[PDB]
Each structure stands twice: as C-alpha cells, then as structure tokens.
Amino acid sequence: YNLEAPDQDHAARAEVCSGTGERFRIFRAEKTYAVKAGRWYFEFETVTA
Amino acid sequence: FLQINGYAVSRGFKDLELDTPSIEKRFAYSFLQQLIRYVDEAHQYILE
C-alpha cells in the first residue's frame, strides 16, 4: 500500500521573533558630527548576511 | 446591529471544503496543462 507524503511547503514565517518593541536597530553617529561640505568615506563590515 | 447584539454572519461555512491547498490540485488544471494540451493543435496540424 504505497504512501505519498504532501509536497514540501515553503517557509514564510520570515523568522521575525524579536520583541514587540523592535524589529530593527539603528546605529548612527552623533548629530554634532554632521558634515556639510567635502568628501567623506566610511566602512561597514557585515559579520552576517 | 447584528454585531452589537452579538450575532456573527458566516460566509464560507457553506461549501467550506475546497480541497486545493496546492497539494491535491497539482499544476494548473485549466491554464498551463490545458494550454499545453491544446498544443495538440500542433499534432492535428501535422495530421492535416
């Protein structure tokens, strides 16, 4: 008596298991360090993707 | 007034079963496979 399992279902939960207060966290430089003229560069390393 | 008195009207309880959830109803019964089947126009074209 052959058995056929239901086909695989995609995962759409989006792993959003954070607290209700936050879904993302924003880190910024201080307002006083605002640049208004010139050439500026900074680096962002991504430990995770 | 229904809602305030606490009566909730129910929509798809009639014929609540539809049996699709994309699990029992494989592919597209009436668009994709029906199109590719109607491509038998090509087979009858060969016969012509």
From Swiss-Prot, chain A:
Q: What's the subunit arrangement here?
A: Homotetramer. Can also form heterotetramers with RYR1 and RYR3. Interacts with FKBP1A and FKBP1B; these interactions may stabilize the channel in its closed state and prevent Ca(2+) leaks. Interacts with CALM and S100A1; these interactions regulate channel activity. Identified in a complex composed of RYR2, FKBP1B, PKA catalytic subunit, PRKAR2A, AKAP6, and the protein phosphatases PP2A and PP1. Interacts directly with FKBP1B, PKA, PP1 and PP2A. Interacts with SELENON. In cardiac muscles, identified in a complex, composed of FSD2, CMYA5 and RYR2.
Tell me the compartments it is located in.
Answer: Sarcoplasmic reticulum membrane
In which tissues or organs does this protein occur?
Detected in heart muscle (at protein level). Heart muscle, brain (cerebellum and hippocampus) and placenta.
Within the intact protein, the region shown is: 1062 to 1110 of 4967
The protein in question is named Ryanodine receptor 2
Q: What induces it?
A: By TGFB1.
Give the protein's biological function. Cytosolic calcium-activated calcium channel that mediates the release of Ca(2+) from the sarcoplasmic reticulum into the cytosol and thereby plays a key role in triggering cardiac muscle contraction. Aberrant channel activation can lead to cardiac arrhythmia. In cardiac myocytes, calcium release is triggered by increased Ca(2+) cytosolic levels due to activation of the L-type calcium channel CACNA1C. The calcium channel activity is modulated by formation of heterotetramers with RYR3. Required for cellular calcium ion homeostasis. Required for embryonic heart development.
Organism, by scientific name, is: Homo sapiens
Task: Tell me which disease this protein is linked to.
Answer: Ventricular tachycardia, catecholaminergic polymorphic, 1, with or without atrial dysfunction and/or dilated cardiomyopathy: An arrhythmogenic disorder characterized by stress-induced, bidirectional ventricular tachycardia that may degenerate into cardiac arrest and cause sudden death. Patients present with recurrent syncope, seizures, or sudden death after physical activity or emotional stress. CPVT1 inheritance is autosomal dominant.
* Post-translational modification, as annotated: Channel activity is modulated by phosphorylation. Phosphorylation is increased in failing heart, leading to calcium leaks and increased cytoplasmic Ca(2+) levels.
Point out the gene that encodes the protein: RYR2
Record's domain comment? The calcium release channel activity resides in the C-terminal region while the remaining part of the protein resides in the cytoplasm.
Family in the record: Belongs to the ryanodine receptor (TC 1.A.3.1) family. RYR2 subfamily.
